[PDB]
Amino acid sequence: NSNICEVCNKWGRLFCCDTCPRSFHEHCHIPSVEANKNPWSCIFCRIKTIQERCPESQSGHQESEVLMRQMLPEEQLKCEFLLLKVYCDSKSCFFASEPYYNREGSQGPQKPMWLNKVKTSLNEQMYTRVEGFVQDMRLIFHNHKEFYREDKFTRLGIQVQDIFEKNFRNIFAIQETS
């Protein structure tokens, strides 16, 4: 196994995958690394199994159909993995915890949102369709762009949204376009 957390790239108390060489902090993995289960397989491994069981699942899909899917176990997992792919980027730190808004010339968003809130909502099974999860994730970046206006810090929202969108298209096999 690797000697660093796959998500945050630090050492520490790490749980090792049985079917691949990745390792995780307990609360860096999503879902949080399970109490027992020997062997244990990481989310990366579980996602790869879905693809291997149903190779046609990699054929192109329309985003509108994906969003309307109900959050059955495989879609739950896919959203957990997409969330984890965002935490994998170090720039996710800016969006992880609850924000506050006090900048001259700007007003805070009407509906604040942040990654740990989306993480709790997934854990609590609060999303009934893929659309709910995707709307909250895009809302994080949209709130940031609106609030920061012409400050160059706006760019952090563009950067982390690009990580989200590339991973969304990969994980849910969105049909490639020009």
Establish if 122 lies at the interface with Zn ion (CB under 5 A).
no
Question: Among all residues, whose Cβ is closest to Zn ion?
Answer: 5
CA angle (146 as vertex; 87, 112 as ends), nearest 5 = 55
Establish if 8 lies at the interface with Zn ion (CB under 5 A).
yes
> Could you tell me how many residues of this chain bind Zn ion (CB under 5 A)?
11
By CB under 5 A, what part of segment 29-88 binds Zn ion? Answer: 42, 44-45, 54
CB of 100 to Zn ion, least distance (A): 25
DSSP letters for 9-49: ---SSEEE-SSSS-EEETTTSSSPPPSS-SS---HHHHHHH
* Cβ distance to Zn ion smaller for residue 10 or 166: 10
Instruction: For the chain, report the end-to-end CA distance as a whole number of angstroms.
Output: 39
Establish if 4 lies at the interface with Zn ion (CB under 5 A).
no
Alpha carbons 71 and 129: distance in angstroms, whole number: 5
Among 15, 28, 81, 140, binds Zn ion (CB under 5 A): 28
Based on DSSP, count helices (H) and strands (E) in the chain, helices before strands. 7, 2
Site residues (CB under 5 A) for Zn ion? 5, 7-8, 17, 20, 25, 28, 42, 44-45, 54
